[PDB]
Design a protein around this ligand. Sequence first.
Ligand SMILES: [Mg+2]
Ligand SMILES: [Zn+2]
Ligand SMILES: [Zn+2]
Ligand SMILES: [Zn+2]
Lengths: 557, 112, 171, 107, 84, 178, 97, 268
Amino acid sequence: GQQYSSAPLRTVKEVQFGLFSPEEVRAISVAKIRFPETMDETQTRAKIGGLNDPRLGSIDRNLKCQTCQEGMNECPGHFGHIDLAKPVFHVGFIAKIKKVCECVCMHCGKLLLDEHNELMRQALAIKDSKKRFAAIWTLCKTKMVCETDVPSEDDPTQLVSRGGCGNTQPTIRKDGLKLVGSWKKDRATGDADEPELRVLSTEEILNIFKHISVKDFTSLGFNEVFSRPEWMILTCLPVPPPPVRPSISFNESQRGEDDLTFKLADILKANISLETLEHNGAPHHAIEEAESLLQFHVATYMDNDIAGQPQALQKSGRPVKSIRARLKGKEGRIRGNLMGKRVDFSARTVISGDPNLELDQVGVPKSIAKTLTYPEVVTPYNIDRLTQLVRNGPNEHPGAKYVIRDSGDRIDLRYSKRAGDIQLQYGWKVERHIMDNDPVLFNRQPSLHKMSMMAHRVKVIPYSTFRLNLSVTSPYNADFDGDEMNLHVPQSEETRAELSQLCAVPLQIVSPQSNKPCMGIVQDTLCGIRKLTLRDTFIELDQVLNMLYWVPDWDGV
Amino acid sequence: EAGRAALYKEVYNVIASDGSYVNYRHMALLVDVMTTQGGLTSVTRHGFNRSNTGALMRCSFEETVEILFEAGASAELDDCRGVSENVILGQMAPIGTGAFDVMIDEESLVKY
Amino acid sequence: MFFIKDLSLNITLHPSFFGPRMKQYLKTKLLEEVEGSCTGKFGYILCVLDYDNIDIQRGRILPTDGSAEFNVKYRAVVFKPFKGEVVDGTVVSCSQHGFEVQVGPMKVFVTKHLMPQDLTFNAGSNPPSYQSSEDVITIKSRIRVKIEGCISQVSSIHAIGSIKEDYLGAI
Amino acid sequence: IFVYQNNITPSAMKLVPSIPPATIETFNEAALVVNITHHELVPKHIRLSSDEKRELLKRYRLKESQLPRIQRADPVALYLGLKRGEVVKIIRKSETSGRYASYRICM
Amino acid sequence: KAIPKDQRATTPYMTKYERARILGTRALQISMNAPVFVDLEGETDPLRIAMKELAEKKIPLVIRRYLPDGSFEDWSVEELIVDL
Amino acid sequence: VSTSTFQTRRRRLKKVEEEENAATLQLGQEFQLKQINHQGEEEELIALNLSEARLVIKEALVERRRAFKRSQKKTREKELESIDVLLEQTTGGNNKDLKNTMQYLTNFSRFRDQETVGAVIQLLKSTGLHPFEVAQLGSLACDTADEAKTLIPSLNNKISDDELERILKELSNLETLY
Amino acid sequence: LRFGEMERDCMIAHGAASFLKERLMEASDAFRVHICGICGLMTVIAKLNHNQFECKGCDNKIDIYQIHIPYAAKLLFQELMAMNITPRLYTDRSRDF
Amino acid sequence: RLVKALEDIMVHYDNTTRNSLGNVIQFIYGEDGMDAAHIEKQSLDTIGGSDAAFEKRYRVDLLNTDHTLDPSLLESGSEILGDLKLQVLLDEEYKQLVKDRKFLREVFVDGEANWPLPVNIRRIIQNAQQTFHIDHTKPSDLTIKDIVLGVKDLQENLLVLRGKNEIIQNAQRDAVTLFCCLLRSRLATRRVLQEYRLTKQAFDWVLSNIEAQFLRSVVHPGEMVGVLAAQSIGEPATQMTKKVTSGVPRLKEILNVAKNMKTPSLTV
DNA sequence: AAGTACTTGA
RNA sequence: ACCAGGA
DNA sequence: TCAAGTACTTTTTCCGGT
Ligand SMILES: [Mg+2]
Ligand SMILES: [Zn+2]
Ligand SMILES: [Zn+2]
Ligand SMILES: [Zn+2]
């Protein structure tokens, strides 16, 4: 349970995407993040004021967080930072960077085309941020010279001077994490033949991006507040707190650090090397070497499954789990932890049909009812019932498992010394067993239907199978060759109503899929119904009487 | 418009050939969705998932990370109108039960 | 200064109070939270004006919990001090460092060094006093201070003041 | 409207947006042999007035964006000489309602 | 910006969703020891009370019906037809 | 949870420039001249001179005591004692800030009666001075047009010296002789 | 048990809006973070015990809200920040429509 | 793919079908505004048979000694003969039934009469007969005005869209178009009197019940029609087993907007 | 296995 | 991530 | 300049054992 916070509770109305300015990373950061070593204060097992908690989140479970005083199941993580010795490309933005270079002057930071080209003012007109950038690029890519004077908005005889700089633009190509250009030149009207080939540095691209005007970058996909192009190049790297990269700390003394933690220390180590090379006697090539290694780790940390093949492998042969990898579809954050979730108040067992159950009920094995719970609020209407269910305990059928006090702290009837002399108060919740007639969600996966999930009445019964009415077989697409089914128990009066009022089996009879019923009479009943209704078929009094008494709402006539 | 007409005719035939009957409206809606854009928008990551809907909603099918990186680069704003975003946000979606609001009227409460 | 300001507080009522004495409980809950309060944005919220016409509005029922949230729109008298504000107050305390002056709900402290040089501390007096050739400042005495700056602090606002410039000091 | 047998040289084609407000349309003779509008699958498209459009949007509380779209190059949008921003009312025979009207804005 | 009563244009009938959400809400409030506006005629299930409260049209709630543009129409559970 | 205002500006990400506050009449965002009442109408800032403020609270509390008794159906030294009783009746008590304020306002008010506070309000609100200066002129008692122009430095070129002295004269006369 | 994507769809089809929230929150994940009202991030150093809030970087000791999101979403956000992306959460609107 | 493509689509409080951008997909859900569950296949009688047999069924001519309603059909039968004012009403009636018949043949080119529409009228009449113990002997207490105008009124009450403006009002007229043809056909003067043999009270009950049922039949704003549609095409695809590519593969071909399709064909 | 996107030869 | 099974 | 090639992306219903 989380504690009371005086902060006003709200809902998220908008998600404003963007990029971190290095300045922000440094601002939000609670520590920097100097040593690759996790902890062990010279082997003295306690977190090192350098990597995981130089003020960040928490380990130990016991022992609170050093920044917020909260501790473990309250403390969200706290971000840190690593100041990189040299600028590095963000793997993700590597091609957007390439494309921005392709649109801008690699010397003055001005759009290669403007309001002076007709097709350009046409493309600039585009309202769509992505589509506009799309068009600007296809135009600007081929413009290989930053223009000084372009023909006037009337005649070609007089040329109007736009922005300055008459420099020739490189023909940029990717060389796996590196951007290498090829300027044609001029040399006696010809040349190329044989152009100048050199790699464009992260810092030079950074400086061109830094010089791209607000008006200009805003014409491209960018936003002067949330995403300036200069932010696609990493300077100050945010360090995610332990909650993101938890150590699977087996036994008492055995580390068990996360994959992200190691990959970080790799970056850390790769950074310290670089910084000392440039501070000390810089052997010039030794730097463009250690730089390319830091660029590698900062790239592979975010996305490991890069085109220019060499996958960063953990010492085991097994490759490193990237952050990109964490989020990627079905199994993994979005699709696996958010769109779908493992849930509590769920049960699953083998199904078997029953002709004695009602269409809308479901047979619930006692053991399952004795586990599954509803948190009922102590009200004057139910005070006496609930007091008996509590008296009954977690072991007897109509019983309860827990009593929740005003205080918020859970009473375990299984163990509490005061489990007998428990004395209920209005406003407490009693976590009672699942009882006959409670509404529950019954499901049979796949679940290609509204109908694959229907709300049923409970029916606590003996034996380990979920029991269902035979006519309800079809919507679920169930048979009893060994099919299992899922049951979900709502915890609120609000959700209970949703189920009973919208999802209930009877409501589901006539289906909108084909404007006709999705449940009918089947198997034995369909077979015997023909057999019963032939002209040849007559029934003697003795049996007629039983046939009659069997109809539960028979008029007695 | 004739594109829609054919698109339905064709979709309907796949269903009808198998013996199966699906009420008009269902096929109509799909057919219409593909069409309303001006052309034939595919039920792929290249079609519908490339529309101007919320970043989080779109990221929940096929291009996840790539979509989210672009959201950062363009400083996209999720409206938070879609189902998928509210699901991600652990909020009550503006779906059936949540398609309207409930308030207490002090006036009628003082009347009863 | 001393203003009348239009304000609004969001209140979350538990279902048990959806009885006819609702607006009544609501108005009172507002007075509890709001009145006697001290924010920095608005300063001292002293007295809620015109009780009979407090606007409760419609309360939205919060979905998973039963409760209803109301944005109680209202209007009240406030005290917000400012640097440069000349205030008339009464001495409350007195020490070797200076003296505190009660200006409405707030206290303004005058440093020994923010007073004229002639005015000097006297320990051997009941109560402790400040003595000029012509003036005597002590616990019950009234002073006109110029607020030099404020510090917004939790359930209060405190300020440093001066009586060194012209037309300031004992009144 | 200019009706041509086989082609219009890109030299001549560059003089089309030359004389505003006046507009010019190029139509390859070979397309016009059969009237597409006459086809089984082709419903009634109706070019709305500026006032009529204004009302459509008022009555449905729509931003121009929110309306279904007809491409500027659409065989029917061409037949009617639809201009960007112009709206068409489409009247189709419904198996559901008998008559149904959609609207499409130009691209 | 809030549509005036005289200019309302949504169904005069309550939706399946509205009714379900009202019964849910009331059961939740009744269960949270809220004041009940009906004579419980020996009732105990907060849902069954809510059903009774909706039947007697003594539910003090209002449905705020939002339109796709953002505007809204306020409808009382008292005024809403329950043919469902 | 705290209280909010009629000011709704959307400071998206761009935090600061949280400018200073003075007698350059640069008060807060909150204490600007163009305010907006809850009815939505633009209404200019309400500043009170102690005397004005004393009557306001008294009024509100007296009327609260009317409503509280209705719902329950089914000499300056002497003003201080009477006020301290009305506070026990209407306020939560725990609000020492209000008791302190009321004792202060009772002991520091220049104009005892509403009639008197009226004339002050008319005489002053005709100068076209910002509500702040207009209140400060009511709150601080000044003789030389200098005393005023010194203690209320914002006035500096806003009014004539003789004009101010004429106003200072009428305010002196209005003073309710305790 | 897994209440998966497909199951979510049937719930959406039913219009069981609260039931869905209860599965995804109460019955699983559900967590409480404090967000800053200026930079819509989980920056807030909520020393909820001393009622102290703060978001250094915004120097905001006031404009702070509390929100209920699935722990997996807190995680997602922290993960996107790790990769320099800002998933700024806002408790009011600005766009309309 | 289908679910992910349609999820955010639902009916808003303006009977309009919109996505999460509020862009209009359908102006009215399923072109009629009705909930699929509340629809049943009904026969639009008017549509077929001979132009000859149509007349025998529908036509009433009080100015012809043979084509008048026999006074065995209704009490007024005797005094109704040669009433020119009433014959204006019956000619209006018939001229509309002839209009309907043409329009129907334009919608349904092959002449298919069986179409799923809301409110099973056949059943309403059936029930009126057992409920009121309808005597297929005694003459009706109905007026021509009682029937002719009664039907003209019920029509005004079959509400789908509520707005007070031409756009929304014509929208309503259109949405209700087909139902009304069925309605006018099944409730024409000769049919009601000679076939159904209804009393005023029974006919009045038949009328209120069509209204009640129709209203019940309209979709509920909030209905997640996106998921519904997606699942209603999805689920059957799972039960799937000149020679053209068909079934699951052709479906994959369709949704993908496959450029290079397998069995291209033209039907000239 | 099937598309988009971009690069390469005539 | 693999392997083996169930509907 | 326009066709052909190359890069490189991308999926697949829910429930013991390394
Ligand atoms: Mg089976
Ligand atoms: Zn912490
Ligand atoms: Zn240049
Ligand atoms: Zn912040």
